[PDB]
């Protein structure tokens, strides 16, 4: 089949429970990509349909700040998802290396993430799993694009119609509405953007407990603050944008298109 | 820890 004929495989870039990502070259085109490789015989039909779902949602999306899926090739024993190669690693890794970002750098970062998220929302896709582990730097060069990845938990929504679709996401990034079994939709991604923006500016999250019982109570209550001294020199407008994203009521919470016009993003 | 938390990787989904 077409992958073995058209591509050469090189070094491992990343690994999951059920996948390996290797650099590949589309030999006749002289173009590099990242191949996410799944051993199909080791997976259930349920795991297969989750993969088909991910590929289907990725193909809806064409944006400079979203990892593009170029091809999907099912060979005997292995399935290949051919994505953009990105070489700058996870935003999570960048934040640990730098400790935290300047307001200028954090504004530039969250602007690109909001552009990606708005594009998803306009295409009726809710990601549900926004986190720095899931945002990739296109390269290691300064100013390299941040790109949304891992649509394995994403859902398709019908206009603005909401429901409790189910319990999905990453504990520290979960929205109050998801934890309360309230109807949800696009706003869950803006809550995660808030958690991300908080982390960018000081290098730790607004909600953390070893004890998940306490973590979920803390998220549902909107129980975060801005401790001294690190937050004392942070502009009020940066705090205001975080507060508008970490609004417990998902109706009142800032939208992606609204956040893109907030003066902390717009005035640059 | 006085408001400062660790940044800990969260790979595991619910």
Swiss-Prot record, chain A:
Resulting phenotype, residue 132 to A: In MRD53; uncertain significance; no effect on protein abundance; no effect on autophosphorylation; no effect on neuronal migration
Disulfide bonds: none
Substrates-to-products reaction catalysed: L-seryl-[protein] + ATP = O-phospho-L-seryl-[protein] + ADP + H(+); L-threonyl-[protein] + ATP = O-phospho-L-threonyl-[protein] + ADP + H(+)
Modified residues (Phosphoserine): 251
EC annotation from Swiss-Prot or TrEMBL: 2.7.11.17
Ranges for domain Protein kinase: 7-265
Function: Calcium/calmodulin-dependent protein kinase that functions autonomously after Ca(2+)/calmodulin-binding and autophosphorylation, and is involved in various processes, such as synaptic plasticity, neurotransmitter release and long-term potentiation. Member of the NMDAR signaling complex in excitatory synapses, it regulates NMDAR-dependent potentiation of the AMPAR and therefore excitatory synaptic transmission. Regulates dendritic spine development. Also regulates the migration of developing neurons. Phosphorylates the transcription factor FOXO3 to activate its transcriptional activity.
Protein name as annotated: Calcium/calmodulin-dependent protein kinase type II subunit alpha
Source organism of this protein record: Homo sapiens (Human)
Gene: CAMK2A
Residues represented out of the complete protein: 7 to 274 of 478
Curated annotation (Swiss-Prot), chain B:
Tissues expressing this chain: Brain-specific. Isoform 3 is ubiquitously expressed.
Signal sequence bounds: none
Superkingdom per UniProt: Eukaryota
Record localization: Cytoplasm; Postsynaptic density
Function field: Required for normal synaptic spine architecture and function. Necessary for DISC1 and GRM5 localization to postsynaptic density complexes and for both N-methyl D-aspartate receptor-dependent and metabotropic glutamate receptor-dependent long term depression.
Family: Belongs to the LAP (LRR and PDZ) protein family.
Subunit structure, as described in the record: Interacts with CNKSR2 and DLG4. Interacts with CTNND2/Catenin delta-2. Forms a complex with N-cadherin through CTNND2. Interacts with CAMK2A.
Protein name in UniProt: Leucine-rich repeat-containing protein 7
Organism: Homo sapiens (Human)
């Amino acid at each position: 089949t077409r992958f073995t004929e058209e591509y050469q495989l090189f070094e491992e870039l990343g690994k999951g429970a059920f996948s390996v990502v290797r650099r590949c070259v589309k030999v006749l085109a002289g173009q590099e990509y990242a191949a996410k490789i799944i051993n199909t015989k080791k997976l259930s039909a349920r795991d297969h349909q989750k993969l088909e779902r991910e590929a289907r949602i990725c193909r809806l999306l064409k944006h400079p700040n979203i990892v593009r899926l170029h091809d999907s090739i099912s060979e005997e024993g292995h399935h290949y998802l051919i994505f953009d190669l990105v070489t700058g690693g996870e935003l999570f890794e960048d934040i640990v290396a730098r400790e935290y970002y300047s307001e200028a750098d954090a504004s530039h970062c969250i602007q690109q993430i909001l552009e990606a998220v708005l594009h998803c929302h306009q295409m009726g896709v809710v990601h549900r799993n926004l986190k720095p582990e899931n945002l990739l730097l296109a390269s290691k060069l300064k100013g390299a694009a941040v790109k949304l990845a891992d649509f394995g938990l994403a859902i398709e929504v019908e206009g603005e119609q909401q429901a409790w679709f189910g319990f999905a996401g990453t504990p520290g990034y979960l929205s109050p509405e998801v934890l309360r079994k309230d109807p949800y939709g696009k706003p869950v991604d803006l809550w995660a953007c808030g958690v991300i923006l908080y982390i960018l500016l000081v290098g730790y999250p607004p909600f953390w407990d070893e004890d998940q019982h306490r973590l979920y109570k803390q998220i549902k209550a909107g129980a975060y603050d801005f401790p001294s001294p690190e937050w004392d020199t942070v502009t009020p407008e940066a705090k205001d944008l975080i507060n508008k994203m970490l609004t417990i009521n998902p109706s009142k919470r800032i939208t992606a298109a609204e956040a893109l016009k907030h003066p902390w993003i717009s005035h640059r | 820890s006085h408001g400062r938390r660790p940044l800990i990787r969260q790979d595991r989904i619910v």
